[PDB]
Amino acid sequence: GKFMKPGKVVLVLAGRYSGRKAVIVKNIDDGTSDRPYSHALVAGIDRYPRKVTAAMGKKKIAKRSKIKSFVKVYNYNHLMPTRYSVDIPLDKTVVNKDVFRDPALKRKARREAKVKFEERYKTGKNKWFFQKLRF
Amino acid sequence: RGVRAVRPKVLMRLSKTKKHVSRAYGGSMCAKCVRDRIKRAFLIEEQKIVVKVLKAQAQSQK
Amino acid sequence: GRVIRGQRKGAGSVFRAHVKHRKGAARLRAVDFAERHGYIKGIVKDIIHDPGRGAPLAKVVFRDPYRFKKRTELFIAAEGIHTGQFVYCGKKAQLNIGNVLPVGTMPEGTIVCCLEEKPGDRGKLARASGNYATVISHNPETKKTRVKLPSGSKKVISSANRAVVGVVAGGGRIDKPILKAGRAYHKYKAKRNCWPRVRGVAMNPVEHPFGGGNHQHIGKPSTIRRDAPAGRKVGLIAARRTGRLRGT
Amino acid sequence: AKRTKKVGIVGKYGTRYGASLRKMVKKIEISQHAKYTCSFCGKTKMKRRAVGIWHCGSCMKTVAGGAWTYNTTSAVTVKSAIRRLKELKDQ
Amino acid sequence: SLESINSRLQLVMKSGKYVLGYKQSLKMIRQGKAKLVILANNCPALRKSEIEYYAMLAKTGVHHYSGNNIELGTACGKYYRVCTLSIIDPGDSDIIRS
RNA sequence: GAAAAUCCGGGGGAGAGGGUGUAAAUCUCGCGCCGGGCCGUACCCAUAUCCGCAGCAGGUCUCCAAGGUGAACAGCCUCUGG
RNA sequence: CCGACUUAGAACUGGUGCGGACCAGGGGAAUCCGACUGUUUAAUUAAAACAAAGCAUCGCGAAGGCCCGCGGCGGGUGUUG
RNA sequence: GUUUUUUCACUGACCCGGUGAGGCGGGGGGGCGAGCCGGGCUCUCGCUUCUGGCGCCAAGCGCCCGGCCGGCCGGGCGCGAC
């Protein structure tokens, strides 16, 4: 369909997180009065879960796959859309544009995306999405 | 841009933040040809999976 | 009793080549398993000018097939090479310009350059500016590819020895006249001390066997014996036929 | 205005070097300083850097061409000939 | 059907709604307006796959024009050169069924 | 139309770090602390400290560079200085 | 409201003096040679001599040509073709 | 047979070229073509070519082997890489 959905995986193209994988939670097809460019809020993965190996410790593996997430508004042309998509809720109640007023609220959207990328990393579903891009 | 134009042996003194911009390949490569080497690093990798899928055709019919 | 200019040239010190700003030894890549049995991909980084060479060179940065490092080779730039062009080298590599492969695995009437005359010597033949070597024929038994050279003489080669496909760049530079002596001064300062050519008839008889005389003449036949000794061997060396050439 | 009748870029040499050696060299001297039509961008920017090495001042793409012209006659006839024997091999 | 594309390209320029250029077409692909994308053959091969991957997602036909961006600009009735072209509405043109 | 010493950034992710603290490992942040040995250093630098047998009209590499006249670092005249 | 420097024009005027010192091309018509620029016998020859671009042959496809070296699995041209 | 001896290839001194002396030669396991009514063979390829990314320090699958109270806290060895 119209390939900028609230479920699409998305390569972050510029900024601090250049090359990080992101999933759109909100597409804003027209320009809002604040952001006149056509934009889409993403919640991506800053620090990736590492390549894990068999005959490691139980407590050791629990240190490796610690997703550190981010949450950010980007443009449609500061992002690269992919054919991949992730089935993830990421509720509007937390992951929201109301969260860019308080740095205390933003520790929860960074924490909300963190969990739902962590506790669905151990599934093996969307295993492309958690392996870092090679450049 | 974002890196000080200075004598090379001065950079021992300069802090880490003076010497690199906060990005992947930051202070080593230009942001324009970073975002060409993010797309290519993906679109070439996508093209490899089309070869992985077209290899899953031509042997199953003989 | 004074040594002639050519004998002095052989020694060194002054008549040596000016190899300071020379941008390196234009040679091929070394043969390994990724040359002999298949191919390997390496990108052209930048076409570059070598002071003391008419043709330009090419920094072609290959990946190392064994080590984590990335190797870089100074090729003779084929005419039509560009930066970021993929140049493939080995047996199974294709037959297009820059794309180097051994001569046994290309058809006859094929233009090559930077060709190995012996297998391994890593580029020796037909590798000055704009020179083309053709692949005349093949001999599947005994590995004898006859190769026409820029001179015109055909050489039997070992058919398992590699040449870059296409002609060498900087082609047709000898069409432009050097109009002023200063341009020639600058040409030979890049190469070696040999330019301001003093003709023997101007030289005194103690320096050069064409010297002396109240007229500025030779007096002896300028065409000389191949056996002729070190210092006497001057003029038209072992000249089969001489004078003005007509037709072919 | 029109300022020289039939000396071009080789008017800079004035009286020196001959008539035929300022009637022959003009052909080379024009071509080597010509802003040629680039194939990678289209921008009239293929400027001769050095000898046989042509540079685009837009893409920043260096090309190993002919000395005085971007493509010599006996380099492009080779390209088609190499490409003709290419198809004649593989089939 | 080589010389018929020069005729059809005019019929988008005169009647239809078009977007010449990359950045503006790369958006009007993403708006779901692009019913075709036309590329020149001397466009960057990174930008070639960039377009061909958006037109995979948009499910839009990527026509490869058999001339350079200088020839494409002349065909598209302009005096400037253009690699990337997208058509919003062809107008009175069978460019999609051709 | 120089090399090399030297310096820095990056990409990788082997590791290390502490278990909710009296936090840890760690820091190219701001102060603090101690140290920097060895050799040359005067003066002439040219119509008198150099080389030409000499206070020899020769020769000998550079830096700074006022006002007027003027195209002008031309020539002539003047200021500081000598 | 603040101008910074010239070009042009006409007046008037001196005993026709005035680029007032300084700075600072004698000119034409032919001949021979060397195209030119460059260079040259430091201390008697700066030349028409040398060099020169251009032109032309000659050698050589590398165990090779050309040359060096008492010598060598030696050395220069050669980081060459 | 013995020697004089022209003519082909032999390698083993001897010379040359490359290399950071990195896969050479036979043979087998494994894929494309050929012939017999699951059968045993004659020869061919042996993994990268649409784009100025990425690639090192092995994943995987086997098997022995250290404690304490047949269940709990790791190292080593093979194919992978004939």
PDB file of N, CA and C in Angstrom, chain D residues 13 17 20 30-31 34 36 38-39 42 47 49 52 55-56 59-60 63 71 73-74 78-79 84:
ATOM      1  N   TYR D  13      51.437  32.573 -29.313  1.00  0.00           N
ATOM      2  CA  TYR D  13      52.826  32.271 -29.754  1.00  0.00           C
ATOM      3  C   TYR D  13      53.345  33.356 -30.706  1.00  0.00           C
ATOM      4  N   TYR D  17      57.656  29.981 -34.354  1.00  0.00           N
ATOM      5  CA  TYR D  17      57.537  28.494 -34.370  1.00  0.00           C
ATOM      6  C   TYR D  17      57.087  27.982 -35.745  1.00  0.00           C
ATOM      7  N   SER D  20      52.851  26.542 -40.482  1.00  0.00           N
ATOM      8  CA  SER D  20      52.250  25.181 -40.457  1.00  0.00           C
ATOM      9  C   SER D  20      52.299  24.590 -39.041  1.00  0.00           C
ATOM     10  N   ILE D  30      43.063  23.814 -28.986  1.00  0.00           N
ATOM     11  CA  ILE D  30      41.604  24.082 -28.784  1.00  0.00           C
ATOM     12  C   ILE D  30      40.996  22.938 -27.960  1.00  0.00           C
ATOM     13  N   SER D  31      41.181  21.693 -28.413  1.00  0.00           N
ATOM     14  CA  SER D  31      40.514  20.467 -27.892  1.00  0.00           C
ATOM     15  C   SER D  31      40.901  20.201 -26.432  1.00  0.00           C
ATOM     16  N   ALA D  34      39.039  22.474 -24.099  1.00  0.00           N
ATOM     17  CA  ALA D  34      37.584  22.453 -24.381  1.00  0.00           C
ATOM     18  C   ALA D  34      36.832  21.881 -23.174  1.00  0.00           C
ATOM     19  N   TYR D  36      34.161  19.786 -22.278  1.00  0.00           N
ATOM     20  CA  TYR D  36      33.428  18.705 -22.990  1.00  0.00           C
ATOM     21  C   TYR D  36      32.172  18.313 -22.206  1.00  0.00           C
ATOM     22  N   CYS D  38      30.133  16.006 -20.249  1.00  0.00           N
ATOM     23  CA  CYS D  38      30.308  14.858 -19.316  1.00  0.00           C
ATOM     24  C   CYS D  38      29.204  13.824 -19.563  1.00  0.00           C
ATOM     25  N   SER D  39      29.521  12.538 -19.390  1.00  0.00           N
ATOM     26  CA  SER D  39      28.604  11.390 -19.622  1.00  0.00           C
ATOM     27  C   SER D  39      27.929  10.951 -18.314  1.00  0.00           C
ATOM     28  N   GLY D  42      26.248  15.026 -17.354  1.00  0.00           N
ATOM     29  CA  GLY D  42      25.797  15.832 -18.506  1.00  0.00           C
ATOM     30  C   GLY D  42      26.386  17.232 -18.485  1.00  0.00           C
ATOM     31  N   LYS D  47      37.057  18.761 -17.978  1.00  0.00           N
ATOM     32  CA  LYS D  47      38.249  19.639 -18.115  1.00  0.00           C
ATOM     33  C   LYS D  47      39.506  18.776 -17.970  1.00  0.00           C
ATOM     34  N   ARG D  49      42.863  17.695 -16.765  1.00  0.00           N
ATOM     35  CA  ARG D  49      43.726  17.924 -15.574  1.00  0.00           C
ATOM     36  C   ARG D  49      45.193  17.876 -16.016  1.00  0.00           C
ATOM     37  N   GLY D  52      46.241  12.747 -20.679  1.00  0.00           N
ATOM     38  CA  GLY D  52      45.443  11.516 -20.844  1.00  0.00           C
ATOM     39  C   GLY D  52      44.484  11.275 -19.692  1.00  0.00           C
ATOM     40  N   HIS D  55      39.030  15.234 -16.022  1.00  0.00           N
ATOM     41  CA  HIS D  55      38.367  15.418 -14.704  1.00  0.00           C
ATOM     42  C   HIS D  55      37.063  16.209 -14.876  1.00  0.00           C
ATOM     43  N   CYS D  56      35.994  15.757 -14.213  1.00  0.00           N
ATOM     44  CA  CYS D  56      34.681  16.447 -14.106  1.00  0.00           C
ATOM     45  C   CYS D  56      34.675  17.296 -12.830  1.00  0.00           C
ATOM     46  N   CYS D  59      30.764  16.098 -10.550  1.00  0.00           N
ATOM     47  CA  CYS D  59      30.714  14.736  -9.946  1.00  0.00           C
ATOM     48  C   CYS D  59      31.997  14.436  -9.158  1.00  0.00           C
ATOM     49  N   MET D  60      33.112  15.096  -9.500  1.00  0.00           N
ATOM     50  CA  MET D  60      34.494  14.765  -9.047  1.00  0.00           C
ATOM     51  C   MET D  60      34.808  13.323  -9.466  1.00  0.00           C
ATOM     52  N   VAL D  63      38.637  10.499 -15.402  1.00  0.00           N
ATOM     53  CA  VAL D  63      38.544   9.520 -16.527  1.00  0.00           C
ATOM     54  C   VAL D  63      39.883   9.514 -17.273  1.00  0.00           C
ATOM     55  N   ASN D  71      38.208  11.396 -25.989  1.00  0.00           N
ATOM     56  CA  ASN D  71      38.200  10.045 -26.612  1.00  0.00           C
ATOM     57  C   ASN D  71      38.905  10.111 -27.971  1.00  0.00           C
ATOM     58  N   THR D  73      40.179   8.446 -31.550  1.00  0.00           N
ATOM     59  CA  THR D  73      39.458   7.641 -32.575  1.00  0.00           C
ATOM     60  C   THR D  73      39.771   6.149 -32.394  1.00  0.00           C
ATOM     61  N   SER D  74      41.038   5.806 -32.125  1.00  0.00           N
ATOM     62  CA  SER D  74      41.551   4.412 -32.022  1.00  0.00           C
ATOM     63  C   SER D  74      41.468   3.883 -30.578  1.00  0.00           C
ATOM     64  N   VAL D  78      38.235   0.428 -30.666  1.00  0.00           N
ATOM     65  CA  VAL D  78      38.683  -0.706 -29.803  1.00  0.00           C
ATOM     66  C   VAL D  78      37.524  -1.112 -28.879  1.00  0.00           C
ATOM     67  N   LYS D  79      36.846  -0.142 -28.250  1.00  0.00           N
ATOM     68  CA  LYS D  79      35.757  -0.378 -27.257  1.00  0.00           C
ATOM     69  C   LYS D  79      34.624  -1.195 -27.891  1.00  0.00           C
ATOM     70  N   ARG D  84      32.217  -6.316 -29.292  1.00  0.00           N
ATOM     71  CA  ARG D  84      31.731  -7.212 -30.378  1.00  0.00           C
ATOM     72  C   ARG D  84      32.253  -8.633 -30.129  1.00  0.00           C
TER      73      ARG D  84
END
